[PDB]
Design a protein around this ligand. Structure first.
Ligand SMILES: [Mg+2]
Ligand SMILES: [Mg+2]
Ligand SMILES: [Mg+2]
Ligand SMILES: [Mg+2]
Ligand SMILES: [Mg+2]
Ligand SMILES: [Mg+2]
Ligand SMILES: [Mg+2]
Ligand SMILES: [Mg+2]
Ligand SMILES: [Mg+2]
Ligand SMILES: [Mg+2]
Ligand SMILES: [Mg+2]
Ligand SMILES: [Mg+2]
Ligand SMILES: [Mg+2]
Ligand SMILES: [Mg+2]
Ligand SMILES: [Mg+2]
Ligand SMILES: [Mg+2]
Lengths: 96, 76, 57, 137
RNA sequence: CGAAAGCUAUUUAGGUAGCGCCUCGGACGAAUACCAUAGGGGGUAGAGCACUGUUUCGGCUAACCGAUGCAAACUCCGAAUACCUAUGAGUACUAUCCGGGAGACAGACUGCGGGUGCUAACGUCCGUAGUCAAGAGGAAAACAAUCCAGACCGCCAGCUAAGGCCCCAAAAUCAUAGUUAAGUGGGAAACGAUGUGGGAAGGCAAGUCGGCCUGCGCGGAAGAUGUAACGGGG
RNA sequence: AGUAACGGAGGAGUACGAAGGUGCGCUCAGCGUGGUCGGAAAUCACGCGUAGAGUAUAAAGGCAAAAGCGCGCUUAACUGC
RNA sequence: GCUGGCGACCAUAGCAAGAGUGAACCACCUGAUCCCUUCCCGAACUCAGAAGUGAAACCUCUUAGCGCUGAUGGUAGUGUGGGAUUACCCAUGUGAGAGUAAGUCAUCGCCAGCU
């Protein structure tokens, strides 16, 4: 059982400059899709996610993402790492 | 001493009249080496594949057919 | 309606040609000059081109 | 020394080297790999030198995958000639290296020996490198 | 009032002619430009491997399949800008045409996109913007081409720009929280190292061990008249 | 659109009275099989995926109403514009 | 409800595999006498037909199997102002290609015949 404590990522926090500002303070953008609902943009914490990505069971079972009284049961779908440093930059999450 | 150093003179090919422009009958619309554009309604094609207008109207480009060709036509 | 006051702050002598024409098309003549213009989209376009040497209130 | 068997043209414009290596930057053949954290050129002589060093340390075990291939030719002018009169003659061949690109990969060795061999080979390269292992997503 | 150092041709190449760029007179006044909205066609940046080439490992019997890269003269794709047209606001003696008089056709540097050279040159050749040329004042010690700014004349008046406020020399020995001990600041790489400040984690039982990510420092560091690689004092 | 270098690569100084006009008509190349010499390739007959064939000639842009390939009749390879 | 013809559109519309139809229409089918053909051949092009069969074909229905379509988020690139000089950073505007979720076994116009 893994849990990543997220926060909402509305507009005017989406884009290229806003995402660079997010990463310059150790936060990671992410998106949640699947099911029958609309996607949900999210901000996760970098150290939390780095810690989670070291266990092989995180890639297989259902993870809980809490964006504030809203729990989502998702699986990690895709990951974007920086090419020179392996720092994760974006994560996709499929509703499961 | 080398074996290069040649070239041709320019030819000035291209689109002369764009979409939404008015034209008189006879105006050249496209100078092209092959048929990048094909002749639609009120447009003729010369011996060197020059597309020209044969009536007064307004130029319009489109894509048509089962081969997805580019056509230009004049709307009166 | 809506009207705005615009002031020229920096010099305009070594800017691009269209940036000098944007200032000339608003009524601005020198540093510290302030003019009063209508708040249309067409005026806002010129004000947006030269945001780095004008001040809007 | 690696080079293509035939090419379309002999000589090539200089060009610039910008950007990052988004494609050849994931371990895809073995367990452990050496990656470039900086940009530069890599001649065919340096490729062969690092290959020899690695395969000497590894005791002919496992496998080595070369993932860089030198296919861009470089010309020079002879000594004591003036500035005109055509382009020079092809002298050697390089691969362009953008930060992120995997250079070598090893298979079938425990990580400690692979890291010793990689530390031996990183001393013969013109840019800064790092060591990387396989990962899932 | 105010250029050009370009294009085309030349027994031409430091000459000259037509066109481009300046000026004066006449005609004619929104046709013109800037911006917004609307209608257009691209094959560049990037990317990709569908063609043309080239590259790596495997499978199968040169070729097909799987995985994996590259390209000025490859493209299944594909911008931002730029360019063309119509309509509209506001602000500008704008745009056109017809005549008199020219000069100029050796350019230079800086930034961006390139070819050539050694991604050398205060090198050379194009595109594009700024300055000089033909432009004075302030800063950069001094310093055509950098930064700020365009000098009609006069004033022992005032506010600012770039850059600055311990003394030479005008203005803070100003306030708040940190880092540096190297005169680092105030010249330089691969690489080396218990320097020192910060951060996310681990192993073992008065804590200890070594590992990563980072701010600022250390070594690597030898030249000829005189300190002489902060303008100086400091 | 245009754009320079003693920058990187290639061609031309012709051909054709049909290789021009016109009406009508056709569709390449590649592979596998069965077939007298005859074989990996002549000429047949039949199938599956196909634009990779061709164009007098270099490359590029093109080419199904084929601009590619045949047959009959012809001189519009006309005069004034 | 099954058709024939002419179009719009040009794969979310196509290829594959399966299944169905013969009143009518269409197709195969009969004969070459006449019209008309074959660089040979009634194969195809024609003509006069009507014993047959829905075998082949066409047409309509089923299944994403191959294809095609395709977000959102991020990334690359980039105009303008500033800072650095190996090609990046900051502000502001813009924004792919690839890949992921997902979608598709067609929509429509004019006419004539059948039941
Ligand atoms: Mg930006
Ligand atoms: Mg003047
Ligand atoms: Mg001259
Ligand atoms: Mg006049
Ligand atoms: Mg490119
Ligand atoms: Mg000259
Ligand atoms: Mg010049
Ligand atoms: Mg020079
Ligand atoms: Mg002079
Ligand atoms: Mg001056
Ligand atoms: Mg001065
Ligand atoms: Mg001075
Ligand atoms: Mg003082
Ligand atoms: Mg104090
Ligand atoms: Mg997007
Ligand atoms: Mg997309």
């Amino acid at each position: 059982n893994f849990v990543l404590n997220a926060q909402a990522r509305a507009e005017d926090k989406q884009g290229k400059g806003a995402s660079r500002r997010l990463r310059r303070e150790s936060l990671v953008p992410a998106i949640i899709y699947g099911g029958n609902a609309e996607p949900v943009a999210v901000t996760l914490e970098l150290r939390e996610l780095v810690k989670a990505l070291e266990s092989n069971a995180f890639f297989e079972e259902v993870v809980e993402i809490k964006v504030g009284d809203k729990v989502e049961n998702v699986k990690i779908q895709a990951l974007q790492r920086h090419p020179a440093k392996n720092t994760p930059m974006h994560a996709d999450f499929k509703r499961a | 001493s080398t074996k290069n150093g040649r070239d041709s003179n320019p030819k000035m090919l291209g689109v002369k009249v764009y979409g939404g422009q008015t034209v008189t009958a006879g105006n050249i619309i496209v100078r092209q080496r092959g048929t990048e554009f094909h002749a639609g309604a009120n447009v003729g094609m010369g011996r060197d594949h020059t597309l020209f207008a044969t009536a007064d109207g307004v130029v319009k480009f489109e894509v048509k057919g089962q081969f997805g060709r580019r056509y230009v036509k004049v709307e009166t | 309606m809506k009207t705005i006051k615009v002031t020229q702050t920096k010099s305009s002598s070594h800017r691009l040609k269209n940036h000098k024409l944007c200032l000339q098309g608003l009524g601005l003549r020198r540093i510290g000059h302030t003019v009063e213009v209508q708040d249309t989209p067409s005026n806002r376009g010129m004000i947006n081109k030269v945001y780095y040497m004008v001040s809007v209130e | 020394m690696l080079q293509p068997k035939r090419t379309k043209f002999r000589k090539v414009h200089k060009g610039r080297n910008t950007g990052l290596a988004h494609r050849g930057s994931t371990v895809s053949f073995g367990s452990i790999a050496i990656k470039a954290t900086e940009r530069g050129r890599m001649t065919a002589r340096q490729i062969e030198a690092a290959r020899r060093t690695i395969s000497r340390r590894i005791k002919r075990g496992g496998k080595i995958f070369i993932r860089v291939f030198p296919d861009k030719p470089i010309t020079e002018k002879p000594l004591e000639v003036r500035m005109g009169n055509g382009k020079g003659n092809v002298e050697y061949w390089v691969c362009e290296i953008k930060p992120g690109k995997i250079l070598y990969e090893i298979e079938g060795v425990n990580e400690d020996l692979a890291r010793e061999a990689f530390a031996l080979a990183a001393a013969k390269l013109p840019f800064k490198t790092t060591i990387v292992t396989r990962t899932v997503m």
